[PDB]
Design a protein around this ligand. Structure first.
Ligand SMILES: Nc1ncnc2c1ncn2[C@@H]1O[C@H](COP(=O)(O)OP(=O)(O)NP(=O)(O)O)[C@@H](O)[C@H]1O
Ligand SMILES: [Mg+2]
Ligand SMILES: [Zn+2]
Ligand SMILES: [Zn+2]
Lengths: 102, 54, 628, 250
DNA sequence: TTAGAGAATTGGAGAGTGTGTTTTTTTTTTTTTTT
DNA sequence: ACACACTCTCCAATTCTCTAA
């Protein structure tokens, strides 16, 4: 009941969207655009298919490019530390078998 | 205290200078146990006799 | 008169060994050992008259602990045990057992004679064990011969790997199938003494008892793989290894890469030809059965440390003392000292953890003595590794699939310093592995059948020579160094060292190096006042454990100002964090609990000095050699 | 020969199940939660009962909880015998699983133990005690039927042997029970009369954030039975409780 | 009340018989021909 | 052919019973 009350209270707020964007990755200064992108990926779109039986992809893929000391790995560290279903992998120290199945 | 393969060996000498051999680490210190353990190895027991039914 | 107990094949009587060790244990006092030592002048009359082992036994009772150390030289000091010392080496299994049952009885005697409150049942329940050590000269692993079997031995070496704990049975449990009578049986010599018939009087039946596995009693066993130290290997050959069996208390003590000295009986056993039959082979297996392990505080130590920390010339004293025979290179020595102390480790509830470790790169001309400095750091550090660029693969440097996972250099070096030499020879493929480990201090792996992340709190000390192999003043500094920017950005300090000709410098250097050949085994050393390596190690270790500096508001203002100064003109955001970390390392070295303005300014000054910034053309990036 | 400790533990655990007698969450009224849980099981034809270790800790100065904790493997059959009588007393519909119906194999379960150990803390001194463990799952086996109680019939004569007990290896009778026949060979297992259990093997490894300096994670094999098979999933993090055992070279 | 002559029951000594045995990856360091 | 597991058989060691001094 108290969980429902708290959830209803924050659902009712006028400024909920801005607060949600502001609450992603608290330690990183600025870069609101990436934080907004991370939130939308975390929520995701709607999966669906047509009468023909073909499927339409319901989810979002993101890539971050940057020169050094730009703190770009902190976003990956936050995501893998927060999202319930997630895994962290380094492109150098991994194999096709270890990435898909072996 | 120490494990089952650490164990040394003990020799016990009687009067008339004859000697016996027993193993295990507690036998080194406890003669009562060594004397009891010595006889316990021996195979035979005399077989035995035995009143109500129905 | 009466029957006697004799160690098999010796005519040694157990009564004498028992009584002699009892007398030694209840009347030895430390002064005797000092009589055997070089001078009576050493003796502290107040302390050294005390009954050392009675004091130890009182502590064992009141701390609730079960094992007693014993260095064997004390058996030679007391007259009644001079022969017991030899008998210990020649007959360890019997003599050690005698010592155990002596100690337990003495502990009981103390509480019943001094009529103390402690539970007699508790002391009767416990096992007490002696652990002898410092037995004699160490023995080379290849020089153990078949005349050493079942005698005590001492070995030095390095630990490769440890198997998981194995359950070893000690008591068997039987239950009667028909009448449910039960018996507990003692295991000796590896053989279960199963009863012929059920022992209950009215159920005297054959084949009637049976074993119940999970109601037996077991004990822990583990096997450790020890490797020969390079000091002993024959000419033109590769090191060997020997296996150690270890039990109970000592089981999980030691990790891969540890360096130890041990003490134990050297044993041998047969092995079967096949698992079906009693047929044995003529060659026997050999191993070591350890009873003690050693790694290779007082108010006086604290007084010495606090008194040394009050000296005015402390920073220069410590720096010139890490590598005494190396001439000048003071800034390099200072930077290495601060790497030894390190920053502070930080962990938040959220927002992650921040590394305390410092990474250093030494770059410059040949013959400048870079590799000689890496030798000192490799021997000073408690844990660490030295390696070469052409000697290292990506797998070997981090971790190896073998289905089991195995450790590489950066993992063995955890919490220590990893020295890498000829850094400019390894390929871009191998160097790319270091990005993640340096930034995060973790190693992520995802390969067939294994996926995980491991911790690597490892400090890197690197050595390289520029492109063209001698520093070219017609190229800018970044082009001479030639590491790519994502990797060059990860070092806290980068040093340029240059082979500049100067008659003043050259006469001093020549006099210094030639003075080493005026003696056969030199006593000469570069400076009048340096600290011994042991005490210096004590200082650094204590300061790492007890001291944890914090940022002061004044330090915060100076750091912001200094960063904006270097930035406004290239300084990256990492220059700020490395400055914070260097300032923290400087604060520990003075045993302060706070970072102050002085520490921040020293951190800034050392960064500017290392990369020759004052001599750098601010626009072209070339260095004026005349200003060096 | 008979173990007095077992019978006393049995009929003490009986009294705990009867009269733990905690008061209501809202009021000072006795509620008797474990009897209510038995009634709930009767309503839904369940086969497992959950017990709180804190409730057992405060009972009868803690001696019962100590006996259960340190010697679980000795006392588990006596706990089963204790529970069977109470369920008979208050809910005899639960004793059975038309022709005749075989007996229900009840399962006792415990939770909220005082502390959780790591895989690295398993040591042979704790064999047969009650424990709780945590780790990440890395593999799981398919569900297999395990033979729990067996029944055999002779080939050379019309005779039957029943309720043979297995432990770790597949086990068969020692004699022909009819003295008119001596054949020991050619037994067959009656699949209708014998009884099986669900069995699943799973494999776990240490939590990554707990690994000590310079070390690598150890692993362990865990057994799941009854209504808890297929509950675990690869890559998830779990907490387990039970007893550690020792398995032979069959 | 002792003891000695005869009968019945059991143990295991030891002799015999049959038996079993030899014997597609996936990951990682290194040389070689191919674009 | 060489250690093992298992079966078969005979013989004497043992205790029990009856009789008379
Ligand atoms: N300042 C110095 N103090 C002591 N020895 C020095 C000094 N400068 C040079 N040397 C000696 O010169 C040699 C330097 O060898 P080394 O340590 O390999 O230098 P390096 O910087 O590693 N050169 P290189 O391996 O060619 O890049 C050693 O014999 C040193 O003892
Ligand atoms: Mg060199
Ligand atoms: Zn029995
Ligand atoms: Zn039959």
């Amino acid at each position: 009941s108290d969980e429902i009350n708290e959830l209803k209270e924050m659902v009712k707020d006028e400024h909920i969207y801005d607060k949600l964007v502001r609450s992603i990755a608290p330690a990183v200064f600025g870069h609101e655009a990436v934080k907004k992108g991370i939130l939308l990926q975390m929520l995701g779109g709607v999966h669906k298919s047509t009468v023909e039986g073909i499927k339409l992809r319901g989810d979002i893929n993101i890539c971050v490019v940057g020169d050094p000391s730009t703190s770009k790995s902190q976003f990956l560290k936050y995501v893998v530390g927060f999202a319930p279903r997630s895994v962290y992998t380094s492109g150098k120290a991994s194999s096709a078998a270890g990435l898909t199945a072996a | 205290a120490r494990h089952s393969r650490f164990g040394g060996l003990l020799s016990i000498q009687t009067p008339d200078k004859t000697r016996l051999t027993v193993s295990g680490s507690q036998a080194l210190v406890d003669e009562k146990i060594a004397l009891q353990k010595l006889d316990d190895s021996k195979k035979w027991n005399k077989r035995i006799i035995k009143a109500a039914e129905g | 008169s009466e029957p006697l107990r004799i160690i098999w094949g010796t005519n040694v009587s157990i009564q004498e060994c028992t009584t002699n060790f009892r007398n030694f244990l209840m009347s030895f006092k430390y002064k005797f050992r000092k009589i055997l030592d070089e001078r009576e002048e050493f003796i502290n009359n107040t302390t050294d008259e005390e009954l050392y082992y009675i004091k130890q036994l009182n502590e064992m009772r009141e701390l609730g602990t079960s094992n007693l150390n014993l260095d064997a030289r004390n058996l030679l000091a007391y007259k009644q045990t001079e022969d017991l010392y030899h008998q210990l080496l020649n007959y360890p299994q019997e003599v050690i057992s005698i010592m155990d049952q002596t100690i337990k009885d003495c502990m009981v005697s103390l509480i019943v004679d001094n009529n103390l409150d402690y539970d007699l049942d508790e002391i009767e329940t416990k096992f007490y064990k002696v652990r002898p050590y410092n037995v004699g000269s160490c023995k080379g692993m290849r020089e153990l011969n078949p005349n050493d079997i079942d005698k005590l031995i001492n070995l030095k070496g390095l630990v490769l790997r440890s198997t998981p704990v194995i359950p070893d049975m000690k008591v068997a449990f039987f239950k009667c199938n028909v009448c449910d009578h039960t018996m507990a049986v003692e295991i000796d010599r590896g053989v279960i003494q199963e009863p012929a018939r059920c022992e209950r009087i009215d159920c005297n039946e054959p084949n009637s008892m049976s074993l119940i596995h999970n109601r037996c009693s077991f004990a822990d066993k583990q096997v450790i793989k020890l490797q020969e130290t390079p000091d002993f290997v024959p000419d033109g050959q590769t090191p060997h290894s020997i296996s150690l069996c270890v039990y109970d208390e000592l089981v999980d003590s030691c990790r891969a890469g540890d360096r130890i000295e041990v003490t134990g009986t050297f044993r041998s056993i047969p092995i079967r030809a096949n698992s079906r039959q009693r047929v044995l082979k003529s060659l026997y297996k050999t191993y070591v059965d350890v009873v003690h392990v050693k790694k290779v505080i007082t108010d006086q130590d604290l007084a010495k440390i606090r008194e040394v920390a009050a000296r005015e010339d402390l920073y220069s004293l410590l720096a010139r003392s890490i590598a005494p025979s190396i001439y000048e290179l003071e800034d390099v020595k200072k930077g290495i000292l601060l790497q030894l102390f390190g920053g502070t480790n930080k962990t938040f509830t959220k927002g992650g953890r921040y590394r305390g470790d410092i990474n250093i790169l030494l770059c410059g001309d040949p013959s400048t003595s870079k590799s000689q400095i890496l030798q000192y750091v490799h021997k000073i550090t408690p844990r660490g590794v030295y390696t070469s660029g052409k000697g290292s693969s990506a797998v070997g440097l981090t971790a190896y699939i073998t289905l089991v996972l195995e450790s590489g250099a950066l993992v063995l070096s955890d919490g220590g310093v990893c020295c890498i030499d000829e850094f400019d020879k390894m390929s871009d493929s191998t160097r790319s592995v270091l990005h993640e480990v340096m930034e995060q201090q973790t190693i992520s792996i995802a390969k067939a059948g294994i996926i995980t992340t491991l911790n690597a709190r490892s400090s890197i000390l690197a050595s390289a020579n520029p492109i063209g192999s001698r520093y070219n003043p017609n190229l800018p500094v970044t082009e001479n160094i030639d590491l790519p920017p994502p990797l060059l950005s990860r070092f806290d300090l980068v040093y340029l060292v240059l082979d500049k000709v100067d008659e003043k410098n050259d006469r001093e250097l020549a006099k210094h190096l030639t003075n080493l050949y005026l003696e056969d085994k030199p006593e000469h050393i570069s400076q009048d006042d340096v600290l011994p390596v042991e005490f210096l190690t004590m200082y650094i270790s204590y300061a790492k454990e007890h001291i944890h500096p914090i940022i002061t508001e004044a330090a915060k203002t100076e750091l912001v100002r200094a960063y904006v100064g270097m930035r406004k003109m290239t300084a990256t955001t990492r220059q700020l964090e490395s400055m914070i970390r260097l300032a923290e390392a400087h604060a520990k070295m003075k045993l302060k609990n706070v970072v102050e303005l002085e520490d921040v300014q020293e951190a800034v000054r050392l960064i500017r000095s290392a990369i020759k910034d004052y001599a750098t053309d601010p626009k072209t990036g070339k260095i004026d050699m005349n200003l060096v | 020969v008979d173990d007095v400790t077992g019978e006393k533990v049995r009929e003490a655990f009986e009294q705990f199940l009867e009269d733990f007698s905690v008061q209501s969450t809202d009021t000072g009224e006795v509620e008797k939660v474990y009897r209510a849980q038995i009634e709930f099981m009767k309503i839904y034809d369940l086969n497992t009962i959950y017990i709180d270790y804190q409730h057992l800790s405060m009972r009868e100065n803690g001696a019962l909880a100590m006996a259960i904790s340190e010697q679980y493997y000795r006392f588990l059959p006596f706990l089963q015998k204790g529970l069977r009588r109470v369920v008979r007393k208050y809910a005899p519909e639960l004793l059975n699983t038309s022709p005749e119906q075989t007996e229900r194999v009840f399962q006792i379960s415990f939770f909220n133990l005082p502390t959780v150990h790591r895989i690295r803390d398993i040591r042979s001194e704790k064999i047969g005690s009650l424990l709780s463990i945590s780790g990440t799952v890395t593999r799981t086996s398919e569900v297999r039927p395990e033979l729990y109680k067996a029944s055999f019939t002779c080939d050379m004569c019309r005779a039957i042997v029943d309720n043979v007990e297995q432990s770790f290896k597949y086990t068969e009778p020692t004699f022909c029970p009819n003295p008119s026949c001596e054949n020991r060979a050619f037994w067959t297992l009656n699949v209708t009369r014998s009884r099986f259990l669900d069995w699943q093997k799973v494999r776990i490894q240490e939590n990554a954030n707990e690994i000590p300096t310079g070390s690598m994670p150890r692993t362990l094999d865990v057994i799941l039975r009854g209504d808890s098979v297929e509950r675990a999933k690869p890559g998830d993090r779990c907490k387990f409780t039970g007893v550690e055992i020792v398995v032979p070279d069959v």
